[PDB]
Amino acid sequence: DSSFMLESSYPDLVINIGKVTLGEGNRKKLQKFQREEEKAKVVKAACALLNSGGGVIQLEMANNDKHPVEMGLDLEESLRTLTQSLNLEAFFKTKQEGKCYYIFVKSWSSDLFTEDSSFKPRICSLSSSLYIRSGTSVLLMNSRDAFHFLNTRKMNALHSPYEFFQKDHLEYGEIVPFPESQSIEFKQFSTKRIQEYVKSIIPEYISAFANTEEGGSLFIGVDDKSKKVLGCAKEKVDCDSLKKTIENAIYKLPCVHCQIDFTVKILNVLAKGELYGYACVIEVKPFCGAIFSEAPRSWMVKDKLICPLATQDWVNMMLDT
Active site residues per annotation: 187
Yes or no: say if 255 and 292 are a contact pair by the CB < 8 Å rule: yes
> Going by DSSP bridges, is the β-strand pair 216-220/184-187 parallel, antiparallel, or unpaired?
parallel
Instruction: State the amino acid at position 320 in one-letter form.
Output: D
Distance CA 15, CA 85 (A): 23
Distance CA 239, CA 241 (A): 5
With a CB cutoff of 8 Å and minimum separation 6, the contacts of 40 are none
Q: Considering only CA atoms, which of 227, 241, 228, 225 is closest in space to residue 193?
A: 241
Distance CA 179, CA 41 (A): 43
**How far out from the chain centre does Cα 316 lie?**
18
Query: After which residue numbers is the chain interrupted with C–N beyond 2.5 angstroms?
Result: 157, 257
Other C-beta atoms closer than 10 Å to the C-beta of 120 total 16
